[PDB]
Amino acid sequence: KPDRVKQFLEGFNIETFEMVGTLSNAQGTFALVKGAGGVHRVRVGDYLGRNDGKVVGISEGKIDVIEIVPWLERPRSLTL
Amino acid sequence: IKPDETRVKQFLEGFNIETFEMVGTLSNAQGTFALVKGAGGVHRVRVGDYLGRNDGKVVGISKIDVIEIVPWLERPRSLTLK
Amino acid sequence: HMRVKQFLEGFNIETFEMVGTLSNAQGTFALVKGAGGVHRVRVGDYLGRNDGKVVGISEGKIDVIEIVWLERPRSLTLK
Amino acid sequence: HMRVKQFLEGFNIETFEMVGTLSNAQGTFALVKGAGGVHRVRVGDYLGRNDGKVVGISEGKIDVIEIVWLERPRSLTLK
Amino acid sequence: IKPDETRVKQFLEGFNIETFEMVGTLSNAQGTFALVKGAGGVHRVRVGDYLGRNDGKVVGISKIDVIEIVPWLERPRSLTLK
Amino acid sequence: RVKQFLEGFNIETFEMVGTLSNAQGTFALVKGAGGVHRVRVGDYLGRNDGKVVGISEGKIDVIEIVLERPRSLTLK
Amino acid sequence: RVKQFLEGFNIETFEMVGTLSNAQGTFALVKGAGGVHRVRVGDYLGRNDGKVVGISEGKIDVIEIVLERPRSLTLK
Amino acid sequence: KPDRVKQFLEGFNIETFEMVGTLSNAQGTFALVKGAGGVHRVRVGDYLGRNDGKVVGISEGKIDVIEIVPWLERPRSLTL
Ligand SMILES: [Zn+2]
Ligand SMILES: [Zn+2]
Ligand SMILES: [Zn+2]
Ligand SMILES: [Zn+2]
Ligand SMILES: [Zn+2]
Ligand SMILES: [Zn+2]
Ligand SMILES: [Zn+2]
Ligand SMILES: [Zn+2]
Ligand SMILES: [Zn+2]
Ligand SMILES: [Zn+2]
Ligand SMILES: [Zn+2]
Secondary structure, three states: OOOOOOOHHHHOOHHHOEEEEEEEEOOEEEEEEEEOOEEEEEOOOOEEOOOOEEEEEEEOOEEEEEEEEOOEEEEEEEEO | OOOOOOOOOOHHHHOOHHHOEEEEEEEEOOEEEEEEEEOOEEEEEOOOOEEOOOOEEEEEEOOEEEEEEEOOEEEEEEEOOO | OOOOOOHHHHOOHHHOEEEEEEEEOOEEEEEEEEOOEEEEEOOOOEEOOOOEEEEEEEOOEEEEEEEOOOEEEEEEEOO | OOOOOOHHHHOOHHHOEEEEEEEEOOEEEEEEEEOOEEEEEOOOOEEOOOOEEEEEEEOOEEEEEEEOOOEEEEEEEOO | OOOOOOOOOOHHHHOOHHHOEEEEEEEEOOEEEEEEEEOOEEEEEOOOOEEOOOOEEEEEEOOEEEEEEEOOEEEEEEEOOO | OOOOHHHHOOHHHOEEEEEEEEOOEEEEEEEEOOEEEEEOOOOEEOOOOEEEEEEEOOEEEEEEEOOEEEEEEEOO | OOOOHHHHOOHHHOEEEEEEEEOOEEEEEEEEOOEEEEEOOOOEEOOOOEEEEEEEOOEEEEEEEOOEEEEEEEOO | OOOOOOOHHHHOOHHHOEEEEEEEEOOEEEEEEEEOOEEEEEOOOOEEOOOOEEEEEEEOOEEEEEEEEOOEEEEEEEEO
16 A cells, blocks of 8 residues: 655656666665756655655665555666 | 735746655755755745746745735645655 | 857856955956866956956956957856 | 764764764764764764764764763764 | 863963964855864864954954953954964 | 876875765775865775775775785774 | 776767876776766766876867767866 | 065065976966974075065976065075
């Protein structure tokens, strides 16, 4: 079931985004996602796109997302 | 209530407020700023600054609270940190 | 007025903010937030895609004269 | 309290300024001007050569507890 | 005239004023700052800030003009751009 | 060997502040020399020929020559 | 060839802002990729294998491969 | 004859300074001089040290200075 305050990158089409790298720093790991006119530092547990796309993993140049669609889980990836 | 037609509009008034994200707050010796990611950069925005195309005046940073003027009435909006 | 075009001529002037002025032992510069950084711009430098020559920096304002041939003054002002 | 010493432990704490605070989606950091840059310092980080542990950031002040063994609280305050 | 013994001294009060250089001025949306090279960095110093070990209060930026308190009397000093 | 810009600083002035991996490779983010720079395995840091030999788990391993001498820069 | 960090940006996002010569060599100062970086002859800029072949008189000469194609970045 | 408002690096012994490089930018050429606890961008026509040491040239990793001493001109250099 889709649920919460939606994040910024939920207001745009996920197909327009691009994974451009992984950055880790003292606070943990982020995927660098180009979309909506900028590069965002996206964490595991953040959301991308219009279908409740939850970021569940960042590894090996790939973001793993689980969307919720008519409800079914539908994985998606964004890769370098 | 009505738009001030002789104030000189600020840079972030030239873009749709829906393309902006609140990414944090910075406080230094001069006071407190909201960090707004928009128009291809990150801007330091103060209370009393403006965001978006509807005279959205920043009235609080604590979340950014904005009051727009729309066809006139006052219409509050906010931008919240993830 | 209308040379090798300067860096900030490769972007739309409407994407730039005058954010301040800096003066140092070498002179006075306007600080222009544009093309993903802040640039130190002098009188005689150029901004935007229409030959926008900087002709004055003063009182938190940069005065620029574009050519669109007709010259057209505009400014960028500090909030 | 008295691990791999952090970068700002290799300099005299008396050379650092609290210059501000920044909060973002990850938490709150004090901005410490020291060792030729500005660092984003969290509670639990260390400053100076005497095990100065940051124990609080609040109201423009960083609270630090050094060990010199006797513990000695001090602070760094924003102007 | 006498030193204020309960104000919290500023960082640049922990160094000799003779080791500082005025390297420029910066003005932004918040106002005007003198850029002071000292104590291993460059600092943004405002009117009403302090420099040096003698309660040197910055009273003007335009050259930085400072008024120190010394054994009390007021003693003006300046730091000038090259 | 052609010298690198970050060899003109004492290695003690550098902090490892993270890692960036992208289509160009894996870089350590080293804070020093006026900003934050991106350093690869086989690049150098410091004044004693400090070659970067590993970037992994928030640590940069460096081997200097003075005798080979291992050094590291660890993410806080 | 091992790729360089500044190959992950469009070359048009870079400005030549000066030159630094010191004990490590002669570097062009290129403003882009989040700050100002120091680039030597034989380093690369941009997404088309833009090799830096000269740094002189406030100009950086670059040769891209797409056919060799000369580009330059000139100090204002 | 020694003459003007003295510059900052005139209040320190020139023998303590070090030439650490040459930087040119849109405004011209500077020598980077480490002294008095910092690195200064010094121009031709600036002064170094306590004996009216005028910088007369910056070239080839070398700063050429002409001091005035008991009066005689006395050249000095600072080199990488
Ligand atoms: Zn975001
Ligand atoms: Zn009202
Ligand atoms: Zn702005
Ligand atoms: Zn520029
Ligand atoms: Zn740090
Ligand atoms: Zn008085
Ligand atoms: Zn300060
Ligand atoms: Zn070996
Ligand atoms: Zn760099
Ligand atoms: Zn060829
Ligand atoms: Zn100086």
